[PDB]
């Protein structure tokens, strides 16, 4: 359980994916040219989980960049760390997917997918022991959502015994590009429910609210949203990237986090909430904030449900004793919110290296039944349109039938019902 293969798909997937690589390259001491320049050897101990070594001891991200139009990947290539990616790992078409899941999954994307799997295979074959895959994408567009879920199905078919992990950006009318986002997301969720082992639900609703209410950003840009996301992503992958005991690989994480195969959608949280401050944060403050609804990246109220399982990760130099004391304090004082039929369902890791700019940070990953609020929201937006068959011609024109819409809706409502069931058990 060593190598992870990273894939980023579509505009959103590639913009957040790029930022991820910038952020962890920095943590691991890797410069844009792929040269290591760090001071601590904790940085290189597990560098091979995410990077291949080339000659000259250059480190190259095990990353594959996918899109059905070249625009965002041109931007990526010109971005800060653009030259660090393997040039052959840029796999793109010309036509785009028009914010259309059917185009991503069945027509434009079907034409491109084999060339992507060709690159995925080349990366997998030089893995000493591939643990699995991580995909960044949005669910609201066409390429990330439609072609991203197509890739997942094909990856599963070729590597059925490997873990599949996604960072999936959920659409919100508050931060929206087109009205068909609920369709694309519903169709996509159906795929994720069956073909991923772990999905971090990143809700653009929450990212916007955080930027607006908490960081005092009057006019949040995608760039501001992505600052929060890359911080969360660095956070939730800390245990995979550095020496440690708990949730140190994708399979152990899934085993600790997923009691029932379909309930694998996680609410991530981060503290302290930061924007592009010298306030020392105390272990008690990190802990209170990491559990605060306002620090959650999926726009669900944790008090409206119960936690099946939780992973907490603390970074920086701090007292292990105080960390243990504080985590026990939150559980003991809000014990009603943690299901009693999974004993000791909260696990805590600490890593001495904090992220850039901070002395101390904490990242929260919860499997809460309150995540149903996210899927209900999407379900209501979907039905409002679908009951009048509005905007469906964009999909039937690519060969899809209404029945597939009816099935994706039924399956997502089923998932909602399954969370409600364990919320009352």
């Amino acid at each position: 359980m060593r190598e992870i293969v990273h894939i980023q798909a579509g505009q959103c997937g590639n913009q957040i994916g790029a930022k991820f690589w910038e952020v962890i390259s920095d943590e691991h001491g890797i410069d844009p040219t792929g040269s290591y320049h760090g001071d601590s050897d904790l940085q290189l101990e597990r560098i091979n989980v995410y990077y291949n070594e080339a000659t000259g001891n250059k480190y190259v991200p095990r990353a594959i960049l996918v899109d059905l139009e070249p625009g965002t990947m041109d931007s990526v290539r010109s971005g800060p760390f653009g030259q660090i990616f393997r040039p052959d790992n840029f796999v793109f078409g010309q036509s785009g997917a028009g914010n259309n899941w059917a185009k991503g999954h069945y027509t434009e994307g079907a034409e491109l997918v084999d060339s992507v799997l060709d690159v995925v295979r080349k990366e997998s074959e030089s893995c000493d022991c591939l643990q699995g895959f991580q995909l960044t994408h949005s669910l609201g567009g066409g390429t990330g959502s439609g072609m991203g879920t197509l890739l997942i199905s094909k990856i599963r078919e070729e590597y059925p015994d490997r873990i599949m992990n996604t960072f999936s950006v959920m659409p919100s009318p508050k931060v929206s590009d087109t009205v068909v986002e609920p369709y694309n997301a519903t169709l996509s969720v159906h795929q994720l429910v069956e073909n991923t082992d772990e999905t971090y639900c990143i809700d653009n609703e929450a990212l916007y609210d955080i930027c607006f209410r908490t960081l005092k950003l009057t006019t949040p840009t995608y760039g501001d949203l992505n600052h929060l996301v890359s911080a969360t992503m660095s956070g939730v992958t800390t245990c995979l990237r550095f020496p440690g005991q708990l949730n140190a690989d994708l399979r152990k994480l899934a085993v600790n986090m997923v009691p029932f195969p379909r309930l694998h959608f996680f609410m991530p949280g981060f503290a302290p909430l930061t924007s592009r401050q010298y306030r020392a944060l105390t272990v008690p403050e990190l802990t209170q904030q990491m559990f605060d609804s306002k620090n959650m990246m999926a726009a669900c109220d944790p008090r409206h449900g119960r936690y099946l399982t939780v992973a907490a990760i603390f970074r920086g130099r701090m007292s292990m004793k105080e960390v243990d004391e504080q985590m026990l304090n939150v559980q003991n004082k809000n014990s009603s919110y943690f299901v009693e039929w999974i004993p000791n369902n909260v696990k805590t890791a600490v890593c001495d290296i904090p992220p850039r700019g901070l002395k101390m940070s904490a990242t929260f990953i919860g499997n809460s039944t309150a995540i149903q609020e996210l899927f209900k929201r999407i379900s209501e937006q979907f039905t409002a349109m679908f009951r009048r068959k509005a905007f469906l011609h964009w999909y039937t024109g690519e060969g899809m039938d209404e029945m597939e819409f009816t099935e994706a809706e039924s399956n997502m409502n089923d998932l909602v019902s399954e969370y409600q069931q364990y919320q009352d058990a």
Partner: protein, 54 residues
């Protein structure tokens, strides 16, 4: 309180004190179990690949 079986050597000693008297599956079977588990994995995988084929 009776001391018994006192044994002494250069490195130490031992004894007993009493305060009061009294008031396997074969290789074949294991292999079958391991093979049956393997076949169950194979069947579940075949079912998945069939579903993906559809």
């Amino acid at each position: 309180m009776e001391v018994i079986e006192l044994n002494k050597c250069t490195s130490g000693q031992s004894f007993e004190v009493i305060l009061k008297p009294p008031s396997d599956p074969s290789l074949e079977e294991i292999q079958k179990k391991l093979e049956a588990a393997e076949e169950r994995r194979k069947y579940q995988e075949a079912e998945l690949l069939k579903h993906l084929a559809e």
